[PDB]
Amino acid sequence: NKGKGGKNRRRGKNENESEKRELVFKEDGQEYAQVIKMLGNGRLEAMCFDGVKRLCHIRGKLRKKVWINTSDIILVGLRDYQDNKADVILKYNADEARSLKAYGELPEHAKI
Amino acid sequence: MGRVRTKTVKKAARVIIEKYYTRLGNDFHTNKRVCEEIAIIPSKKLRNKIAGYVTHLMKRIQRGPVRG
Protein backbone atom coordinates (compact mmCIF):
# COMPACT_ATOMS: atom_id res chain seq x y z
CA ASN A 1 0.00 0.00 0.00
CA LYS A 2 1.05 3.77 0.13
CA GLY A 3 4.69 4.53 0.94
CA LYS A 4 5.22 7.74 3.04
CA GLY A 5 9.18 7.87 2.75
CA GLY A 6 10.91 7.70 -0.72
CA LYS A 7 13.88 5.44 -1.69
CA ASN A 8 15.18 2.29 -3.52
CA ARG A 9 14.69 0.15 -0.33
CA ARG A 10 11.59 -2.06 -1.01
CA ARG A 11 13.75 -4.89 0.54
CA GLY A 12 11.81 -5.08 3.88
CA LYS A 13 8.37 -6.45 4.92
CA ASN A 14 5.61 -3.79 5.14
CA GLU A 15 4.68 -2.23 8.51
CA ASN A 16 0.88 -3.04 8.59
CA GLU A 17 0.13 -0.92 11.75
CA SER A 18 -3.58 -1.68 11.06
CA GLU A 19 -6.76 -3.78 11.75
CA LYS A 20 -6.57 -5.58 15.19
CA ARG A 21 -4.52 -2.88 17.00
CA GLU A 22 -6.21 -3.96 20.26
CA LEU A 23 -5.89 -1.21 22.95
CA VAL A 24 -3.19 -1.87 25.66
CA PHE A 25 -3.31 -0.66 29.31
CA LYS A 26 -0.79 -0.86 32.26
CA GLU A 27 0.21 -3.92 34.27
CA ASP A 28 2.30 -3.77 37.52
CA GLY A 29 5.71 -2.06 36.99
CA GLN A 30 4.55 0.25 34.10
CA GLU A 31 3.55 3.94 33.57
CA TYR A 32 2.19 6.25 30.82
CA ALA A 33 4.50 9.16 29.85
CA GLN A 34 4.86 12.18 27.52
CA VAL A 35 8.21 12.89 25.73
CA ILE A 36 9.81 16.22 26.90
CA LYS A 37 13.18 16.20 24.98
CA MET A 38 15.01 13.83 22.62
CA LEU A 39 18.77 13.35 23.05
CA GLY A 40 21.35 11.58 20.83
CA ASN A 41 22.34 7.89 21.04
CA GLY A 42 18.76 6.37 21.19
CA ARG A 43 17.68 8.00 24.54
CA LEU A 44 15.11 10.63 25.70
CA GLU A 45 13.70 12.68 28.62
CA ALA A 46 10.10 11.83 29.62
CA MET A 47 7.52 12.89 32.25
CA CYS A 48 4.89 10.46 33.61
CA PHE A 49 1.57 11.90 34.83
CA ASP A 50 2.11 11.30 38.60
CA GLY A 51 5.12 13.70 38.36
CA VAL A 52 8.46 11.72 38.46
CA LYS A 53 10.69 12.74 35.50
CA ARG A 54 13.11 10.05 34.08
CA LEU A 55 15.87 9.38 31.54
CA CYS A 56 14.51 6.79 29.11
CA HIS A 57 15.81 4.34 26.44
CA ILE A 58 14.44 2.79 23.18
CA ARG A 59 14.16 -1.07 23.41
CA GLY A 60 16.09 -3.00 20.68
CA LYS A 61 12.79 -4.15 19.03
CA LEU A 62 11.65 -0.50 18.33
CA ARG A 63 14.91 0.61 16.53
CA LYS A 64 14.36 2.20 13.06
CA LYS A 65 10.65 1.15 13.10
CA VAL A 66 8.43 3.05 15.60
CA TRP A 67 9.72 6.64 15.30
CA ILE A 68 9.25 8.54 18.62
CA ASN A 69 9.07 12.41 18.74
CA THR A 70 8.68 15.40 21.17
CA SER A 71 5.24 15.67 22.94
CA ASP A 72 4.39 12.05 21.86
CA ILE A 73 2.58 9.61 24.30
CA ILE A 74 4.30 6.31 25.32
CA LEU A 75 4.11 3.24 27.63
CA VAL A 76 7.21 2.80 29.87
CA GLY A 77 8.58 -0.07 32.03
CA LEU A 78 10.06 0.76 35.49
CA ARG A 79 13.15 -0.90 37.07
CA ASP A 80 13.08 -2.45 40.61
CA TYR A 81 16.53 -0.76 41.15
CA GLN A 82 18.03 2.41 39.49
CA ASP A 83 14.62 4.27 39.66
CA ASN A 84 15.96 7.28 37.61
CA LYS A 85 16.06 5.04 34.44
CA ALA A 86 13.42 3.20 32.35
CA ASP A 87 12.68 1.65 28.88
CA VAL A 88 9.99 2.36 26.21
CA ILE A 89 7.47 -0.46 25.44
CA LEU A 90 4.84 1.20 23.12
CA LYS A 91 3.80 4.43 21.36
CA TYR A 92 0.09 5.43 21.24
CA ASN A 93 -1.35 7.15 18.14
CA ALA A 94 -3.42 10.36 18.73
CA ASP A 95 -6.48 8.13 17.95
CA GLU A 96 -5.50 5.72 20.82
CA ALA A 97 -4.40 8.46 23.28
CA ARG A 98 -7.92 10.03 23.20
CA SER A 99 -9.45 6.55 23.90
CA LEU A 100 -7.17 6.17 26.99
CA LYS A 101 -8.42 9.59 28.26
CA ALA A 102 -12.06 8.64 27.37
CA TYR A 103 -11.71 5.50 29.59
CA GLY A 104 -10.46 7.92 32.35
CA GLU A 105 -7.06 6.12 32.27
CA LEU A 106 -4.98 9.37 32.02
CA PRO A 107 -5.07 12.47 34.32
CA GLU A 108 -6.01 15.78 32.55
CA HIS A 109 -2.31 16.65 31.82
CA ALA A 110 -1.53 14.83 28.51
CA LYS A 111 -1.67 16.81 25.20
CA ILE A 112 -3.38 15.35 22.07
CA MET B 1 19.41 -3.69 -44.15
CA GLY B 2 22.04 -6.52 -43.78
CA ARG B 3 22.74 -9.23 -46.43
CA VAL B 4 25.71 -10.97 -44.68
CA ARG B 5 25.65 -14.83 -44.99
CA THR B 6 25.82 -17.00 -41.78
CA LYS B 7 28.27 -19.99 -41.36
CA THR B 8 25.51 -22.58 -42.18
CA VAL B 9 25.31 -21.10 -45.73
CA LYS B 10 29.08 -20.47 -46.21
CA LYS B 11 30.21 -23.98 -45.01
CA ALA B 12 27.60 -25.93 -47.06
CA ALA B 13 28.57 -24.01 -50.26
CA ARG B 14 32.33 -24.87 -49.81
CA VAL B 15 31.63 -28.62 -49.25
CA ILE B 16 29.41 -28.73 -52.40
CA ILE B 17 32.18 -27.15 -54.58
CA GLU B 18 34.90 -29.54 -53.23
CA LYS B 19 32.83 -32.61 -54.37
CA TYR B 20 30.90 -31.40 -57.49
CA TYR B 21 33.03 -28.71 -59.27
CA THR B 22 32.51 -30.45 -62.69
CA ARG B 23 28.64 -30.09 -62.49
CA LEU B 24 28.51 -26.34 -61.67
CA GLY B 25 28.48 -23.05 -63.67
CA ASN B 26 27.42 -19.35 -63.82
CA ASP B 27 23.60 -19.89 -64.29
CA PHE B 28 21.83 -19.55 -60.88
CA HIS B 29 18.72 -21.45 -62.17
CA THR B 30 20.86 -24.52 -63.13
CA ASN B 31 22.98 -24.39 -59.90
CA LYS B 32 19.63 -24.23 -57.93
CA ARG B 33 18.58 -27.57 -59.59
CA VAL B 34 21.99 -29.31 -59.05
CA CYS B 35 22.14 -28.40 -55.31
CA GLU B 36 18.66 -30.03 -54.80
CA GLU B 37 19.79 -33.53 -55.99
CA ILE B 38 23.35 -33.75 -54.50
CA ALA B 39 22.22 -32.66 -50.97
CA ILE B 40 19.34 -32.84 -48.45
CA ILE B 41 18.34 -29.21 -47.62
CA PRO B 42 15.29 -28.79 -45.23
CA SER B 43 13.93 -25.46 -46.68
CA LYS B 44 13.36 -23.93 -50.17
CA LYS B 45 14.50 -20.54 -48.73
CA LEU B 46 17.83 -22.09 -47.49
CA ARG B 47 18.38 -23.90 -50.86
CA ASN B 48 18.12 -20.54 -52.71
CA LYS B 49 20.76 -18.92 -50.37
CA ILE B 50 23.26 -21.85 -50.78
CA ALA B 51 22.96 -21.87 -54.63
CA GLY B 52 23.46 -18.05 -54.50
CA TYR B 53 26.85 -18.23 -52.68
CA VAL B 54 27.92 -21.24 -54.84
CA THR B 55 27.23 -19.01 -57.91
CA HIS B 56 29.38 -16.21 -56.35
CA LEU B 57 32.26 -18.67 -55.61
CA MET B 58 32.33 -20.16 -59.18
CA LYS B 59 32.93 -16.61 -60.59
CA ARG B 60 35.86 -16.17 -58.10
CA ILE B 61 37.43 -19.63 -58.83
CA GLN B 62 37.60 -18.68 -62.58
CA ARG B 63 40.21 -15.93 -61.64
CA GLY B 64 42.56 -17.53 -59.03
CA PRO B 65 42.80 -19.53 -55.74
CA VAL B 66 40.28 -19.40 -52.83
CA ARG B 67 42.09 -20.42 -49.59
CA GLY B 68 39.36 -22.76 -48.19
Binding site: - | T8, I16, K19, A39, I41, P42, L46, I50
Partner: protein, 227 residues
Protein backbone atom coordinates in the same frame (compact mmCIF):
# COMPACT_ATOMS: atom_id res chain seq x y z
CA UNK C 1 -29.60 -36.95 -28.57
CA UNK C 2 -32.93 -35.97 -30.24
CA UNK C 3 -31.24 -33.38 -32.54
CA UNK C 4 -27.45 -33.26 -33.08
CA UNK C 5 -25.18 -30.55 -31.53
CA UNK C 6 -23.19 -28.10 -33.76
CA UNK C 7 -19.59 -28.93 -34.91
CA UNK C 8 -17.93 -26.12 -32.80
CA UNK C 9 -19.44 -27.52 -29.53
CA UNK C 10 -18.81 -31.17 -30.66
CA UNK C 11 -15.03 -30.66 -31.28
CA UNK C 12 -14.54 -28.73 -27.96
CA UNK C 13 -16.51 -31.32 -25.88
CA UNK C 14 -14.42 -34.24 -27.30
CA UNK C 15 -11.23 -32.46 -26.05
CA UNK C 16 -12.72 -31.77 -22.57
CA UNK C 17 -13.45 -35.56 -22.27
CA UNK C 18 -9.80 -36.60 -22.99
CA UNK C 19 -8.49 -34.04 -20.43
CA UNK C 20 -10.59 -35.40 -17.48
CA UNK C 21 -9.80 -39.07 -18.35
CA UNK C 22 -6.03 -38.28 -18.36
CA UNK C 23 -6.32 -36.61 -14.88
CA UNK C 24 -8.19 -39.60 -13.36
CA UNK C 25 -5.64 -42.14 -14.71
CA UNK C 26 -2.64 -39.92 -13.69
CA UNK C 27 -3.55 -40.10 -9.94
CA UNK C 28 -4.92 -43.70 -9.87
CA UNK C 29 -1.85 -45.25 -11.64
CA UNK C 30 1.02 -43.03 -10.37
CA UNK C 31 3.13 -45.71 -8.55
CA UNK C 32 2.07 -48.27 -11.25
CA UNK C 33 4.10 -46.32 -13.88
CA UNK C 34 1.40 -44.69 -16.11
CA UNK C 35 2.47 -42.43 -19.03
CA UNK C 36 -0.55 -41.85 -21.38
CA UNK C 37 -4.02 -42.70 -22.76
CA UNK C 38 -5.33 -43.16 -26.34
CA UNK C 39 -9.05 -43.50 -27.32
CA UNK C 40 -10.69 -44.81 -30.56
CA UNK C 41 -14.28 -45.38 -31.83
CA UNK C 42 -15.99 -48.08 -34.00
CA UNK C 43 -19.77 -48.89 -34.50
CA UNK C 44 -21.48 -49.25 -31.03
CA UNK C 45 -17.99 -49.51 -29.28
CA UNK C 46 -15.24 -47.31 -27.72
CA UNK C 47 -11.75 -48.77 -27.09
CA UNK C 48 -9.38 -47.05 -24.60
CA UNK C 49 -5.65 -48.00 -24.76
CA UNK C 50 -3.51 -47.22 -21.67
CA UNK C 51 0.31 -47.12 -21.51
CA UNK C 52 2.33 -48.12 -18.41
CA UNK C 53 5.76 -49.65 -17.52
CA UNK C 54 4.39 -52.40 -15.12
CA UNK C 55 1.22 -53.64 -16.92
CA UNK C 56 0.48 -56.49 -14.43
CA UNK C 57 -0.28 -53.83 -11.74
CA UNK C 58 -2.87 -52.22 -14.14
CA UNK C 59 -4.63 -55.64 -14.45
CA UNK C 60 -4.44 -56.94 -10.82
CA UNK C 61 -4.84 -60.55 -9.54
CA UNK C 62 -7.17 -61.93 -12.33
CA UNK C 63 -7.96 -58.63 -14.14
CA UNK C 64 -9.86 -57.06 -11.14
CA UNK C 65 -8.53 -53.50 -11.73
CA UNK C 66 -9.37 -53.54 -15.47
CA UNK C 67 -12.96 -54.60 -14.47
CA UNK C 68 -13.16 -51.92 -11.72
CA UNK C 69 -11.76 -49.20 -14.07
CA UNK C 70 -14.18 -50.29 -16.87
CA UNK C 71 -17.09 -49.98 -14.40
CA UNK C 72 -16.21 -46.45 -13.10
CA UNK C 73 -15.38 -45.04 -16.62
CA UNK C 74 -18.81 -46.26 -17.84
CA UNK C 75 -20.61 -45.07 -14.62
CA UNK C 76 -19.09 -41.52 -14.69
CA UNK C 77 -19.11 -40.66 -18.44
CA UNK C 78 -22.57 -42.18 -19.22
CA UNK C 79 -21.69 -44.86 -21.81
CA UNK C 80 -24.32 -47.66 -22.19
CA UNK C 81 -23.54 -51.15 -20.74
CA UNK C 82 -20.72 -53.12 -22.47
CA UNK C 83 -19.78 -50.41 -25.09
CA UNK C 84 -16.44 -49.64 -23.27
CA UNK C 85 -13.23 -51.77 -23.32
CA UNK C 86 -9.86 -51.00 -21.62
CA UNK C 87 -6.53 -52.43 -22.94
CA UNK C 88 -3.20 -52.08 -21.05
CA UNK C 89 -0.01 -51.72 -23.21
CA UNK C 90 3.72 -51.74 -22.27
CA UNK C 91 5.85 -48.57 -22.78
CA UNK C 92 8.75 -48.95 -25.27
CA UNK C 93 12.15 -47.26 -24.44
CA UNK C 94 11.04 -46.04 -20.92
CA UNK C 95 14.26 -43.96 -20.48
CA UNK C 96 13.06 -41.57 -23.29
CA UNK C 97 9.63 -40.81 -21.65
CA UNK C 98 9.71 -37.68 -19.44
CA UNK C 99 6.58 -38.57 -17.33
CA UNK C 100 7.90 -42.02 -16.25
CA UNK C 101 11.24 -40.39 -15.24
CA UNK C 102 9.50 -37.56 -13.27
CA UNK C 103 7.35 -40.12 -11.32
CA UNK C 104 10.24 -42.54 -10.57
CA UNK C 105 12.35 -39.56 -9.28
CA UNK C 106 9.32 -38.47 -7.11
CA UNK C 107 8.98 -41.94 -5.48
CA UNK C 108 12.81 -42.19 -5.06
CA UNK C 109 12.82 -38.81 -3.17
CA UNK C 110 9.66 -39.76 -1.14
CA UNK C 111 11.52 -42.90 0.14
CA UNK C 112 14.18 -40.60 1.77
CA UNK C 113 17.14 -40.88 -0.70
CA UNK C 114 19.52 -37.85 -0.84
CA UNK C 115 18.78 -35.22 -3.57
CA UNK C 116 22.09 -35.29 -5.57
CA UNK C 117 22.37 -39.13 -5.39
CA UNK C 118 18.80 -39.42 -6.75
CA UNK C 119 19.23 -36.73 -9.50
CA UNK C 120 22.51 -38.14 -10.94
CA UNK C 121 20.80 -41.59 -10.78
CA UNK C 122 18.15 -40.57 -13.39
CA UNK C 123 20.58 -38.32 -15.37
CA UNK C 124 22.80 -41.41 -16.03
CA UNK C 125 19.84 -43.66 -17.02
CA UNK C 126 18.38 -41.12 -19.54
CA UNK C 127 21.79 -40.63 -21.29
CA UNK C 128 22.55 -44.42 -21.32
CA UNK C 129 19.08 -44.96 -22.95
CA UNK C 130 20.20 -42.92 -26.05
CA UNK C 131 18.86 -39.32 -25.66
CA UNK C 132 20.92 -36.43 -27.23
CA UNK C 133 20.71 -34.44 -23.96
CA UNK C 134 18.62 -33.71 -20.84
CA UNK C 135 17.92 -31.18 -18.04
CA UNK C 136 16.69 -32.09 -14.50
CA UNK C 137 15.66 -29.38 -11.97
CA UNK C 138 14.63 -29.61 -8.27
CA UNK C 139 13.51 -26.58 -6.16
CA UNK C 140 12.15 -25.70 -2.70
CA UNK C 141 13.50 -25.98 0.91
CA UNK C 142 16.55 -28.09 0.01
CA UNK C 143 18.68 -28.11 3.25
CA UNK C 144 17.51 -25.20 5.53
CA UNK C 145 14.51 -22.84 6.07
CA UNK C 146 15.33 -20.60 2.98
CA UNK C 147 14.56 -21.94 -0.53
CA UNK C 148 17.13 -23.02 -3.22
CA UNK C 149 17.30 -24.87 -6.57
CA UNK C 150 19.61 -27.33 -8.41
CA UNK C 151 20.17 -27.78 -12.20
CA UNK C 152 21.62 -31.07 -13.56
CA UNK C 153 22.39 -31.11 -17.33
CA UNK C 154 24.06 -33.23 -20.05
CA UNK C 155 24.36 -33.20 -23.90
CA UNK C 156 22.39 -30.91 -26.32
CA UNK C 157 19.24 -28.81 -25.49
CA UNK C 158 17.26 -26.33 -27.70
CA UNK C 159 15.00 -23.51 -26.29
CA UNK C 160 13.66 -21.40 -29.27
CA UNK C 161 11.68 -21.74 -32.57
CA UNK C 162 9.23 -24.43 -33.80
CA UNK C 163 11.54 -27.58 -33.49
CA UNK C 164 10.89 -27.51 -29.67
CA UNK C 165 7.34 -28.83 -30.39
CA UNK C 166 8.71 -32.24 -31.64
CA UNK C 167 12.40 -32.64 -30.49
CA UNK C 168 11.92 -31.97 -26.71
CA UNK C 169 9.85 -34.09 -24.24
CA UNK C 170 8.97 -32.48 -20.83
CA UNK C 171 7.26 -33.13 -17.46
CA UNK C 172 6.56 -31.19 -14.19
CA UNK C 173 5.67 -32.75 -10.77
CA UNK C 174 5.19 -31.98 -7.02
CA UNK C 175 6.46 -34.00 -3.98
CA UNK C 176 5.31 -33.42 -0.37
CA UNK C 177 7.88 -33.87 2.43
CA UNK C 178 7.43 -33.11 6.20
CA UNK C 179 8.69 -29.48 5.75
CA UNK C 180 6.52 -28.64 2.65
CA UNK C 181 6.32 -29.11 -1.16
CA UNK C 182 9.29 -29.48 -3.56
CA UNK C 183 9.03 -29.10 -7.36
CA UNK C 184 10.54 -31.44 -10.00
CA UNK C 185 11.01 -30.55 -13.71
CA UNK C 186 12.40 -32.96 -16.36
CA UNK C 187 13.33 -32.24 -20.02
CA UNK C 188 14.76 -34.72 -22.59
CA UNK C 189 15.97 -34.03 -26.17
CA UNK C 190 15.12 -36.85 -28.63
CA UNK C 191 17.35 -38.47 -31.35
CA UNK C 192 16.43 -38.17 -35.07
CA UNK C 193 14.97 -41.53 -36.24
CA UNK C 194 14.18 -41.80 -40.04
CA UNK C 195 11.65 -44.62 -39.27
CA UNK C 196 11.36 -46.71 -36.04
CA UNK C 197 9.48 -44.44 -33.49
CA UNK C 198 12.39 -43.87 -31.01
CA UNK C 199 12.11 -40.14 -32.02
CA UNK C 200 10.87 -37.77 -34.81
CA UNK C 201 11.24 -38.51 -38.58
CA UNK C 202 11.59 -34.76 -39.50
CA UNK C 203 15.24 -33.39 -39.33
CA UNK C 204 16.47 -30.13 -37.65
CA UNK C 205 16.02 -27.04 -39.97
CA UNK C 206 19.76 -26.14 -40.33
CA UNK C 207 21.21 -29.71 -40.67
CA UNK C 208 22.22 -29.78 -44.39
CA UNK C 209 23.90 -33.04 -45.59
CA UNK C 210 25.79 -33.68 -48.88
CA UNK C 211 25.75 -37.02 -50.82
CA UNK C 212 29.22 -38.45 -51.66
CA UNK C 213 30.57 -38.74 -55.29
CA UNK C 214 31.57 -42.34 -56.34
CA UNK C 215 33.18 -44.73 -58.86
CA UNK C 216 34.14 -42.36 -61.77
CA UNK C 217 36.98 -43.13 -64.25
CA UNK C 218 39.19 -40.13 -65.16
CA UNK C 219 40.61 -41.41 -68.56
CA UNK C 220 38.49 -42.12 -71.70
CA UNK C 221 39.07 -43.12 -75.39
CA UNK C 222 36.29 -43.26 -78.06
CA UNK C 223 34.51 -46.68 -78.38
CA UNK C 224 31.12 -48.18 -79.45
CA UNK C 225 29.19 -51.10 -77.83
CA UNK C 226 26.22 -52.85 -79.56
CA UNK C 227 23.46 -54.95 -77.83
Amino acid sequence: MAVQISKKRKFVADGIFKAELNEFLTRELAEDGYSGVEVRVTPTRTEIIILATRTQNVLGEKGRRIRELTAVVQKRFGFPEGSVELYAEKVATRGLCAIAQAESLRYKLLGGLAVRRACYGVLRFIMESGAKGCEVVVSGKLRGQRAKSMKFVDGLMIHSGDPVNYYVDTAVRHVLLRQGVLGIKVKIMLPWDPSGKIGPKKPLPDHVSIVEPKDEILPTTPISEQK
